[model samples]
Target: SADNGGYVPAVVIGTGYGAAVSALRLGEAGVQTLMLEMGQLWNQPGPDGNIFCGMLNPDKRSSWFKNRTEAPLGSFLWLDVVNRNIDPYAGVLDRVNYDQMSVYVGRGVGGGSLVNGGMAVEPKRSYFEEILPRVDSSEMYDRYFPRANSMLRVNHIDTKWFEDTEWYKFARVSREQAGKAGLGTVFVPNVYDFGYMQREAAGEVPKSALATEVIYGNNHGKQSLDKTYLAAALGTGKVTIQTLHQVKTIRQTKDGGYALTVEQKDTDGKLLATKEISCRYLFLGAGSLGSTELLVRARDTGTLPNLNSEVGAGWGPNGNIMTARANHMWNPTGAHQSSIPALGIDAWDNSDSSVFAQIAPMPAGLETWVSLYLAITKNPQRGTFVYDAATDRAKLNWTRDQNAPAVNAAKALFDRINKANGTIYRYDLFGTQLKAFADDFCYQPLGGCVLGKATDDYGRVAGYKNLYVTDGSLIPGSVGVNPFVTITALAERNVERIIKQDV
Candidate 1:
């Protein structure tokens, strides 16, 4: 312990959704906690007098250690504008590419909260009960969900303001189309400040959502976890976060403590130094990819031989299917658009294949007569991650063919909408070859170390005491909407039970 960092009572890996929750609670409970983050702590302003660049142009701050920015849109009207080259550095957004899938995640201290669409959705009570039947849904609906919502500061846009503003014209267009198709749309809540957005609409303040600044990161008005949970955790004076300290190895120490072999790296992805830190209470809050890879490697490499086979099992993309519709020229989806989505086509009641499609925006800063939709379907398909000894990395075992159910469900809903409105799918929006669904890139990556499978009901890792999985990894594939609020609420539920019984 002399050559490396010494021991700590509690250690949480990756300052994302679940890690932030654990740090705050542990600090408040009087246990000294340390958080390890592989990405930079974004605080200082860049040369442009902004911490994050808008979506119009992307630079190094847009990606994590990449030579070029990887935006989801392969080709807009102008291909060069969407994809830009940049220097390699530690940035806010990261897209982890596998053989058949690519998962988008935020890299900084706040994690995915920093770069999401800010949609804070509460899954239906029946769906929650159906998903996790073993857990007491009453407890989550009554206590933990409310606590998480309050802490995250979820808010709604004013109905009058939404109707009067040009920024939300895109939403109204999609709502009209969905209504024509005999489908209902519901208001989705968010974590972004609506008052600030309303001011931005009036030309009274700086803008982020209206300026197309979400995929990379937000400069203002976003209540990322760093501004909410991590801020409160730091206020407790017991939680400490070390940025650019990537965890590469984890093993049970000889003295019954978990030792994490960490690396302190620069923003350029250089290896500065390696350290081993021991902790009695270890929480794996790294998202599904991160937390699952850690345990999968540990189990396959025989570091933790007692780990269960479900360590790398039950991985899914939440049935995320992205597609757009070509509207008539008369229906101009205004040049001014907001990246924050407010409404979605609620078809979850379909007896066949249920789908919840968000009426997303094509914010190119120009009037593009196109209505985009990011649909989440209920699919039973699950993927797994296998540890590769040659590369020393856990590789996901998902294929494009496995996403068929989600595509069929989306096609079922969009087909009726197109038929009702006499519209067609936008062949130019995604890529060439008349593609309707963009099934490769996904935003919601859930599962891997599922609840009641890889871990106990309270997120404690099975066969190992004091080891817990408290993030999106506990979710069994899909939560039907944006995953952050559900991740936050479930983390609250688990951490509270952990503190009561295990801590």
Candidate 2:
């Protein structure tokens, strides 16, 4: 590649929010950007002429399974796509008991942004303060965050719906029962619009109400990055996105450029071919698992091992947890409001020490009164990224008790909520359904490449030149509230600095 200008433009290795933002900024500034995405653009239209969010499954989204082909699980392993295309890459990683812990990350043009619950939250003022001295919080607040939020179109659900939407009914019932039991509701802002959904119901520009099962991919509700940033970036011909292109290796060139080996595959997992690209600069935005895996593979194979021992260090799932409580009154429970909670209840629990537990309002669905609560465990679950040379993959060694403080904190709050309320809901309520950890997640698993400690303050890997990580992998600990917003904001900060450096 010839340097049209004095310096060679940068190549971003993932179309995730971070990569997309960096690509957009760089391309808009005329850097001849190339975006290599492991996942395809979420442009699959159903027979009904509607595009589906790869992250969500609508009330009737049987079509997503079709596009699941070639979807990469952690470490570039094949997911459970319908056709059973690729050979299983060893057995699935054993998950924590029942649902005590789980690894959830999204891949595609939008990365996790496509699948996250659209709950945009800024880290607590103190959280940023903690990173102080090392990083300037004031710079973060005024510079990177606002720009990220605007680009993401992050907005709260309609106020009218908060006051009257059926979704709020769930909150109202949960609030009443919790209040009767002495716990108050927590409100938090979301990048979802119940009003737009209502308008869509009234025949407006497509629909995306809270009704669509959000986590599995809302047919029409939350605004994902694919339709936002990636979409806008593509609108400009300066940027080019190659999806379904899995990155295999990274070799640094003497000229300060990078040689990337990208694996091209058909939907069936059959290797179509392999291609190499020479990029002056390379950016790794593969999220925690994906990006870290790339680093580990490069290191284990001598591609860039001496980079730093911190390559797989700061791992955290944002200390995520999900808890539920069931109300006995069960009285109609009123209309199940589909909108997300606008206000969240944050109580700093310092008793157990480093663990701070916060409870956020969660809406289950249109059917039951299954009120939900999301908790962020302060005790960071320390997981490691080890390169598995046999399969050229990275394996995460996760120990359950890593965050003892957080686990104890979650258990304590859960017990209290259970004792206070009639009871919290549990899936397998066959014989007992008391106030205990839910089957799915007391909090999400995390920690492999923490912030401040892992990459540089700006998310650049400690030792490698022309290499940077911009995903949850850089987050140092559990965010007190919903974490997607903070991830985007931090990416904004990193991208700005990268652009200024001509990255």
Candidate 3:
């Protein structure tokens, strides 16, 4: 009866944050799990055979991957992570090849965890309540939320660098200006704040303090998911990751399992071979755009033809406006380079209750001679990414919408704080300069394969029973906070349900 008895029962896609947890939980539940990652393992050994995450030092990092076949070839993989295309999406803004949006993820064993600022925060309570009506808040707080946080090893920095650190002083100035701009408190999570302490102990000031830069892969100051989730998943022994294998598609079998067509490309971009693997359960965690295209392709080609209409709707940008502050007092604005951020503040929008905004916990490296620097935005715009037939890739288009009254109310709260704090709302911060409340920011994209709206609450792909999605795309509404922690917790909740079910 077993088609491939030697094969695993579950195959999880993309090895990012969500997939990392699913792989671990599934493996732990006695189900054989196969984790397929488009990226390679981040912990490559140096020439001296010492393995370390090359995130802090690229030359040393690049030296580790020169001989490696799976890890990306350069220190700047995020800058040039395309398999073929060289152009940005049509009608989109002109792209700087080195721009933050140009490439935002790292491939390999850890996925985005190798490159992202380590921010593990629970979302605004009101936002979560709006998205899932069936799931009671008490249950989430008591069960799932804490469960996810603990598994990721979420912790806060015990020490502070309040004195002599230009980054801290500069951040305070940005905060003041943002306050002047009428924004609320800029909060802090344990992730990035602690990294600064380590770097301070090592006698090196932050790069963000040295340069107004992050998102291009900070040399230090964040605990990317690779070092956290992916690392722990690997330790479970139940999770087996196959790196450098990009999955093209998934097809279901008559017996209820699914088959995957995988292609392993070479360094020079040569297509090597096409292989097929079958599993009883299929989970798609390839992120919003990536997961959206997969379902679209499946539905369009008559594979999962019964996919619900909601598969590609409710897409929100996570309100990513990076509002910059112009002039400030008692701070240096020269270079905003620090290893970690120390603070963050949140003003929940429950009136219209549609948007969510979290003021970025900024460092002092980017702006010298300024007291603080930060960015904040409400609810945010919605966008779409469909499969483009011509290029066979995900094509994204973002459009703005009027903020729901609650979002406006949230903005008012932030605005009052900005005014109170003396934060100047300048037009330019992350590339473009736009006046306060006159701009839209996105990059923290979510939705598309949204929960309830996209594929059903459990991510069953509408008509399909065994197909599930465990990534950020499943959340239909704006989380009003950092998406990583929410994404991980939701996946943890989903995977737990899956293990209990026979399907």
Candidate 4:
């Protein structure tokens, strides 16, 4: 072991929303902090001359340590055109699969912010209360949520551009379909710059969404964490980020500091170095899966034996699923599509079940006359993660039957739309063998180290001093909307409390 003897006052794992928020707060409070990331910083240009690899044409920069790209939509019409082969490198996206479910997440400096659709939405107040009953709802809405949104620079599309632009004609078509079924479509806000998109449509600027940008990194317009929170944290000069360093082990030192063993790897998954670091305060913002896996292994392996029984319990995929409906030839969605999603079919109030489905884009560069959706439903089916000694990793025990409730909830709303529009589910969008829905994977994974159970309401881990969790792991399975905003807002709240009381 290289005895680097490196010590910092605070070390934040993962450079996602929670880590960004924590790093910024800690830096502003005069604490020197180091942020550890397992992925590369996506600031370099590839052979194509662009800083980011686009989803339309992926490169080695599109996926993490995989020779082939693994998009959520793995195939189109059963063709493997969606994936391409390239030399292994530290790419942006990672698709982690369990027995029944696969989760898509980002792996670069900004984490999921690097690959997400820029949809910045807040969950309904009642649903937020129902999910995290111990959290103070009034404080969240009045102080934290607004604070998070302001810092993230969330904004809506220009109403006139949205109504008239040919780029959003697909959204309009989907809206009309939802309307025919008596379902209302709500305008979804985004971190993408609407003004820039409008200019791009007017041929006055470079294109991002209009040119088909998403699921990969967007070169322009989107206000990803690297441009927002992470940027500000670096501006503070008290925060530093170390990329390509994956934390493998964490144990409490004798004098209350934490000891971490990190593995530094290169683009080809070659181990370059193994180093040890000590920190007075350890922040587990390594997302739901990364943070939970670290802690679960620590507890199960006797490194931190005092960790509670709740460390790896109560995990969920935020009830995620995707589907596509065939539109009639007469009601053709325009050939030009904007990859950034801007509207959601709100069928949550239906007595049978709650479902908020985003009118997703189908940017095939051709008029396919298809209406696509990614539905977020209320599926209380929770899964558990267990440390496997064989693989030396945490394995999720999520069964396929657990996802059935969410699929049914989504189908209830789409069934009405299909019946009203005289349309049917398109089987070609998901698989080669004609599958009507793709409920086997999720883009939004939301739990593992749940709040009020595994950690305190303010994100302090129950059995460790100055150890905190501020990511999606704190949300107990569901947030009733796009979860990034909730994750960010909760981190804002928790870090403020920790700074005032614990620090």
| Candidate 4 C-alpha lDDT tens digits along 1-503 | 22353888999999999999999999999999999999989888778887777767778888777778654472364224666888888888888878888888899899999999989999998888877888899999999999999999999988888999888888999899889889999999999999999898899998888877788789889999999999999999999998889999999999999989998988788998889988999999899899999989999999989999999999998889888888899988887888898999877752338999999887677788888889998888999989997899999999989989998998888999999989998887775687777888888888899998999998899899999999999998888789999999999999999999989
lDDT of 4 at 225: 96
TM-score for each candidate, following the candidate numbering: 0.98, 0.82, 0.78, 0.97
lDDT of prediction 4 = 0.88
Determine the backbone clash count of candidate 1. 0
lDDT of 1: 0.88
Residues 1-503 of candidate 3: C-alpha lDDT, one tens digit per residue: 02222356888888777788888888777777787766555454445343332323223233212222112211112222222322211110111111122213445565555445566778777768876775567867788889887777677744355445554554455555546555454445655535555565456864332342233344345566666666666677766777666778777788877888877655334566667877888888777656787887777666777787777777765645433334544544435344345555454454333233433433322333322222234454555656566666655554434334323554555555556665555433333334344234344557888877766666667788788898878876467666778888788877888778843
Write down the TM-score for model 4. 0.97
Tens-place lDDT per residue, model 2, 144-175, is: 77877788887765666566655456566655
**Candidate 3 runs further than 4 Å off:** 1-6, 45-103, 159-164, 176-186, 192-222, 333-336, 352-381, 400-424, 428-441
Q: 1-503 in candidate 1: lDDT tens per residue?
A: 32368898999999988999989999999989999988988898998999998777788999887888754463376434667888899998888999999899889898899889989988888888888988999999999889999999999999999988889898999899888989999989999999889988888899988888887888888899999999999999989899998888889987778998999989888898999898999999889999999999999998888999999999999999999888899899888888888888889863338999998876577777878899999988999989998999999999999999999999999999999999999876666678889888789999999999998898889889999998998999988777888899999988888888877
Better of 3 and 4 by lDDT: 4
